[PDB]
Amino acid sequence: IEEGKLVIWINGDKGYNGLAEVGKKFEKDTGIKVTVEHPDKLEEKFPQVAATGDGPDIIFWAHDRFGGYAQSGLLAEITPDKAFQDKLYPFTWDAVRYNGKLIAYPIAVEALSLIYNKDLLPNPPKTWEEIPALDKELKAKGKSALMFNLQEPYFTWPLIAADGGYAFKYENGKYDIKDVGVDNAGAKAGLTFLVDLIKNKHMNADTDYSIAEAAFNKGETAMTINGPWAWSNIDTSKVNYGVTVLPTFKGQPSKPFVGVLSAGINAASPNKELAKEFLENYLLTDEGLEAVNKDKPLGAVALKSYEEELAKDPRIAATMENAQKGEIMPNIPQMSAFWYAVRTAVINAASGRQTVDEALKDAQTNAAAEFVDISHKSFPISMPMIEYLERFSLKAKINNTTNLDYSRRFLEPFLRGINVVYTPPQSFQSAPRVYRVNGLSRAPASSETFEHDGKKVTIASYFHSRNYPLKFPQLHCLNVGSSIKSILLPIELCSIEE
Amino acid sequence: IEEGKLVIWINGDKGYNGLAEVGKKFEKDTGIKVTVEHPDKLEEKFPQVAATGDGPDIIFWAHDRFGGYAQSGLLAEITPDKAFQDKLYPFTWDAVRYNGKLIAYPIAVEALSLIYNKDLLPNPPKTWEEIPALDKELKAKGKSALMFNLQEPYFTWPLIAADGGYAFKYENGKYDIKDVGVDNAGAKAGLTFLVDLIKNKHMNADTDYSIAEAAFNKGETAMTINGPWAWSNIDTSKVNYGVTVLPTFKGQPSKPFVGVLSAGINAASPNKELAKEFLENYLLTDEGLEAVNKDKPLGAVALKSYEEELAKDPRIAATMENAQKGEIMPNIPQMSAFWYAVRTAVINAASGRQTVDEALKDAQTNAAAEFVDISHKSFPISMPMIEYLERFSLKAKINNTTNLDYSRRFLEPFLRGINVVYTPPQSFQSAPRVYRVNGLSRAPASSETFEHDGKKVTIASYFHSRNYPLKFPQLHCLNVGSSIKSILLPIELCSIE
Amino acid sequence: EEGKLVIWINGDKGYNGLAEVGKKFEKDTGIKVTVEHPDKLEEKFPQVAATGDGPDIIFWAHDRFGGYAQSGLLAEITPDKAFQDKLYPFTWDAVRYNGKLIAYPIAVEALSLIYNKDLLPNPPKTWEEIPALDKELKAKGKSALMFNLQEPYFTWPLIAADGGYAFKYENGKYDIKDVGVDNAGAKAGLTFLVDLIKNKHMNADTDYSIAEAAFNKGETAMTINGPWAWSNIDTSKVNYGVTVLPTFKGQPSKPFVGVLSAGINAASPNKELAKEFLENYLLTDEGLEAVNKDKPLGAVALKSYEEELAKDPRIAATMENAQKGEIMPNIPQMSAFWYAVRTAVINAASGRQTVDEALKDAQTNAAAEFVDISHKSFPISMPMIEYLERFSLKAKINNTTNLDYSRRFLEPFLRGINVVYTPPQSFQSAPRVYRVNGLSRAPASSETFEHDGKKVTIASYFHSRNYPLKFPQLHCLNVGSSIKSILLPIELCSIEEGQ
Ligand SMILES: OC[C@H]1O[C@H](O[C@H]2[C@H](O)[C@@H](O)[C@@H](O)O[C@@H]2CO)[C@H](O)[C@@H](O)[C@@H]1O
Ligand SMILES: OC[C@H]1O[C@H](O[C@H]2[C@H](O)[C@@H](O)[C@@H](O)O[C@@H]2CO)[C@H](O)[C@@H](O)[C@@H]1O
Ligand SMILES: OC[C@H]1O[C@H](O[C@H]2[C@H](O)[C@@H](O)[C@@H](O)O[C@@H]2CO)[C@H](O)[C@@H](O)[C@@H]1O
Ligand code: NI
Ligand code: NI
Ligand code: NI
Ligand code: NI
Ligand code: NI
Ligand code: NI
Ligand code: NI
Ligand code: NI
Ligand code: NI
DSSP: OOOSSEEEEOOTTSOHHHHHHHHHHHHHHHOOOEEEEOOTTHHHHHHHHHHHTOSOSEEEEEGGGHHHHHHTTOBOOOOOOHHHHTTBOHHHHHHTEETTEEOSEEEEEEOOEEEEETTTOSSOOSBGGGHHHHHHHHHHTTOEEEOOOOSSGGGTHHHHHHTTOEEEEEETTEEEEEEEESSSHHHHHHHHHHHHHHHTTSSOTTOOHHHHHHHHHTTOEEEEEEOGGGHHHHHHTTOOEEEEOOOBBTTBOOOOEEEEEEEEEBTTOTTHHHHHHHIIIIISSHHHHHHHHHHSOOSEESBHHHHHHHTTOHHHHHHHHHHHHSEEOOOSTTHHHHHHHHHHHHHHHHHTSSOHHHHHHHHHHHHHOOOOOSSOOOSSOEEEHHHHHIIIIIOSOOOTTOOGGGGHHHHHHHHTTOEEEEOOOGGGOOOOEEEEOOEEEEEETTTOEEEETTEEEEHHHHHHHTTOOOSOTTSEEEEOSOTTSOOEEOGGGEEEEO | OOOSSEEEEOOTTSOHHHHHHHHHHHHHHHOOOEEEEOOTTHHHHHHHHHHHTOSOSEEEEEGGGHHHHHHTTOBOOOOOOHHHHTTBOHHHHHHTEETTEEOSEEEEEEOOEEEEETTTOSSOOSBGGGHHHHHHHHHHTTOEEEOOOOSSGGGTHHHHHHTTOEEEEEETTEEEEEEEESSSHHHHHHHHHHHHHHHTTSSOTTOOHHHHHHHHHTTOEEEEEEOGGGHHHHHHTTOOEEEEOOOEETTEEOOOEEEEEEEEEBTTOTTHHHHHHHIIIIISSHHHHHHHHHHSOOSEESBHHHHHHHTTOHHHHHHHHHHHHSEEOOOSTTHHHHHHHHHHHHHHHHHTSSOHHHHHHHHHHHHHOOOOOTTOOSSSOOEEHHHHHIIIIIOSOOOTTOOGGGGHHHHHHHHTTOEEEEOOOGGGOOOOEEEEOOEEEEEETTTOEEEETTEEEEHHHHHHHTTOOOSOTTSEEEEOOSSSSOOEEOGGGEEEO | OOSSEEEEOOTTSOHHHHHHHHHHHHHHHOOOEEEEOOTTHHHHHHHHHHHTOSOSEEEEEGGGHHHHHHTTOBOOOOOOHHHHTTBOHHHHHHTEETTEEOSEEEEEEOOEEEEETTTOSSOOSBGGGHHHHHHHHHHTTOEEEOOOOSSHHHHHHHHHHTTOEEEEEETTEEEEEEEESSSHHHHHHHHHHHHHHHTTSSOTTOOHHHHHHHHHTTOEEEEEEOGGGHHHHHHTTOOEEEEOOOBBTTBOOOOEEEEEEEEEBTTOTTHHHHHHHIIIIISSHHHHHHHHHHSOOSEESBHHHHHHHTTOHHHHHHHHHHHHSEEOOOSTTHHHHHHHHHHHHHHHHHTSSOHHHHHHHHHHHHTOOOOOTTOOSSSOOEEHHHHHIIIIIOSOOOTTOOGGGGHHHHHHHHTTOEEEEOOOGGGOOOOEEEEOOEEEEEETTTOEEEETTEEEEHHHHHHHTTOOOSOTTSEEEEOSOSSOOOEEOGGGEEEOOOO
16 A cells, blocks of 8 residues: 555654655655654554555664564565665675565664753763762752663663663574573662662653753753764754763673664565665765765764764764663564563653562563464454364364264354454455354355245355355354344454453 | 495485495496495394404494494594585584594484375364374275374374374483483373274284385375385376375374484494595585485485585475484494383383383383493392302402301301302313202312322312313312212302392 | 882793893893892782882783772783784683783793603603603603692693593683582593502602703603793703693693783882883783793783794794693682692692592682682671771761760660770881770760860870871770770770680
């Protein structure tokens, strides 16, 4: 359902106005209109819509999400040749490599750094431990020492990880999804320190990206923790800021998860060729990145040529300095589970509604959860009524010959009371419904007859006429009506719970 | 006991005709004749013959056996340089690394997968649990759902291991041979499920590789469990088959032990140089592997270059998919003990002659069983009468000076009634015999005398003359003389059972 | 200390060479550099440095500095990136403790097998073949092997070969609860050693000196030592070779690798000079060259100098052995570890204890818990203020607290109590034990007394002696008796608690 043009989705904190300038340059050369949008929770919506075969042509996000997207077969395999692949840093390509295939074009490396107000904190803390005292000082002047987004775990992880916490252990080549370190000792310490700052009114548990960005830019707080994209607004606010290494905890460096802004091609986009033309020959160029970067900094771009010149910028330098101390995020499907599990954890712990231990316990459990067998798009868990009967009653597989008369005896008591979800063929343009099952029909669908507009027709017959030949015409149907006032449903179109 | 040529041993289920084509290509270039053979139970015979200094020049088998071979010093340390070592996947070299040394050339990764008849089972089971019902269906059409070699534990391990069973636990670096998991809960579950299929006539306990291969290829059974090497015959049989992931058990994936077909150089081969020339420059090449692979699939070869192209094959893909879910076998010496212990176990449990618990109990014991003093060489375990006296009577070690007169008091009552096994020196060309000990001799063997053909000689003297100088001439002998007619036997040639 | 430079390095090292550097430094700065090599320095430094004494610079293997740093006896060195890039990063790691750099890396050390070519042209490849080899040599009036058995350092390689280890390195750090000196692999190794001694293939009482002397006299075919040792061997004109340590059970010997490091005394007043000497004099090609020429450092840390000496097969074998072993942890628990293993090896080797007995204790002692770094002495004491808060008042005391409100229960709580009164240092007096009879009648600022015909309060008096009491309003502890009292301000008292 995607047109013959280009639609791009990138996160709002990014430079979409810049990316769009590039789009205009593209249209002026090809006539192809490029539209850029920045939907809320896009990393969340893309998967949903793209599953339907909808969504944008290009999707921009940190590489960590694409693995799951690729897994859900929502991304197209990009095809850059060696000539192009050599224009970017190999470690960037690694980030976008999933199952040996390249699933997106690397744009830039991102990493949270400590941003501070020089006019207030000319000499910024070197450790988290000294922050409390620092707050006292500033509080006396009607200010606070630190403020950063506490709603997103991304910003809190650096501290949690500093002294030992981690997502999934990287063992001889890959990630062991059984080994999760968010419940370990190191992680608790970190999370605890945080919780204490909140506890001792040195920070607000409900502080979010917005609250914090606005406070720092108004010069009400001495420090904040953010990424490159954030500098623009600070420039605008005329605040005299500095960007440096994140403080240490228990002498350890804060390990921020490093991200690679990447752009993937919608598996369903019909404009894949255009997509790559725009990405390879427009965005991923010095003039291209320059335009986006000028709206909102990308940080350390992936294009060797452009990164090479912007490298002199100490802000990027500190970015990379922090990157050094942290580690690139895995791109495995388990990541969203991880993030989701940690989000709630930090939050609640921080709110006091849960203890660090309680929180990280669940966190551990959830981040370690296993993927409930796919194709079970339901909850409570559903199961085809055919499978149901086979596994719990007939104790045998059903097929185009099965005769349920032989089983009436026990089947009937087994179906009495049963609530089922009848869902008609899509072509019927109708909707799923719940029905209570009173019992088995008297006869097979191919024998069970009814009349309308003065004509006698069998259920099987009817279905065939509506282009939905029943898989098992010889099976008795489920009676959802009653004795003579029956409503017969073919078992193959029904399912249950548990 | 060998020659200035090349003799190779590979298992019969492998592509020996292909390996041989390579051998011909080698001869045409060197003149060196390469002969390939496939003896029964070769993994078993190699050790025996190679011990004698005999056997083939090259030996082909799954890496798991070479550790024990290397340990028995039956394998030569191969010497491939970095240039070559980079041509194969490092994890393969790991498989063939023992005690830091490389003991064989990796050929290909193998892993059992689920093979099925599409014409019968277009949509194969995803779990073992649904197999029973499936058999019922097929049985009605004069077919069965599954059939695979039950004689070899290799084929049954995937299930046994799925829910927790394992060989030896890998702890921080290596394998703890004290920790064996074939007796655990997970293992029992799996073995039990199997036993039940047999129990409910869904499978035959006596089904072997042959029975099963033939049934599937005749299209009498919907599924089978086998390795790459097996596809060839299926091709030939024109059966429309598919290869996919092994079903799950208790929701767990079947963990097949993964193997690396490797080729080791006989420690005694005098053609080691030729050996490696053939292996490095002929077999381990695209054209080389291609020839063997065309006879019978190697699966996922070790040579990066060739594996790279055959990778597109979904069969290999499923192979590796199953490999993913299982784990490479250890190569430690304890493996054969493991295999042997599990073989009997599965078998017997499957036959009903033993319960899963009984079976796995022994299995555990045997796999874990400690070795026994290399000194003892036969069976029954006999205790030398010297050792016997030391440990139960003298409470002291005996030597070339010991005088038993000092012990007469208690030794005598200790020896009365005692039955002993006297066994003469081999050179005597006689035979072991049981004798009843009446007591200690009057004097030491070197003093105890007797006469024959009119000559006086001491026992010690006599033995020396027959080239068997007694170890302890000064010891008194054991009197076996039933009556006042003494029969003195030197203690060192006696033992108790 | 003074306004100069005093350095301590171990005697087996090249102190005469280090000193040559010192002279070069004085000739340029006028600052006199003195180098000393005290016995058991790794042991004395901590003791003296605690007092605020000791040398300015301390040289030792990196493994000891963690504990030093922990005891706050070392200063944080401040080399900039320009300098930090002149040395190998893995060296800096060795000297990094709690994220901070606590010393300047000098060189990587690792024990290697040294042998007499004229006797053993083809040295053993395994420990197992050593016994037989001894027999051969013994017939010629020589022995196969001889090395320091007094120090565990030399024995660890074998003990560790087949599995023994200090502390397991788990996902980032060392688990001090997981100690592997009592495991199966360790016993095997220790046992093999004990047997060599048992079968008179080696003397349990053989030490570094005995062994160095025997090899250099050409009485033993092999020895196990470090780079520093080659010099004397050169001097002895013995034709030696340096190679990989033999294997045990097919395993390589895992020698603990050390990084010779130099730390700045936390108390040195010449820290600036210290680093100037270290960064611009010692850690230079000409610098290391001087020390190295006295006694080899092995594989230095300065990329530039190590780069040229790398051609030396001796260093090569050093590193080859280093490869097979592993860098020592630098955690505080190390000395406990070393001390525990020292006795263990020794005794087992002497037969006064079985490998199992020995390694049992070793294990126990090694994974020993460390009490808080704050408590510097024994018996452990607790300030009487803290004591009252935590066990009686169940509340924090401050400049307002009035103990009258608590008399009721405080009194019974203090009767019998023995306390350690310790006067301000300026008082030039000494700590004393007193038994507490009870609380004073009034606060220190109200409690009065008279001398030389003058009335003064306790609070008043203290202030006059330049020791203004922290809590003038608190009642004092009465150590006197019926009307004949001795009042002590609680803040100057403490208790050494029981059991
Ligand atoms: O908070 C978890 C969140 O972390 C990362 O998202 C970053 C994103 O990469 C940055 O570009 C920036 O926009 O902020 C985000 C956090 O607000 C992960 O990429 C994301 O999947 C995860 O949910
Ligand atoms: O059943 C125990 C047996 O398992 C493995 O043998 C496999 C071999 O690896 C495959 O290549 C193929 O030949 O079939 C064998 C089972 O029939 C072990 O490699 C072997 O040592 C072990 O005894
Ligand atoms: O033996 C225990 C001892 O080992 C290490 O000391 C080594 C030192 O590193 C070497 O350079 C050489 O001098 O010999 C010493 C052993 O005699 C540790 O550094 C030390 O702390 C430990 O006690
Ligand atoms: Ni907006
Ligand atoms: Ni928006
Ligand atoms: Ni109608
Ligand atoms: Ni045959
Ligand atoms: Ni045969
Ligand atoms: Ni005769
Ligand atoms: Ni000295
Ligand atoms: Ni001295
Ligand atoms: Ni006076």
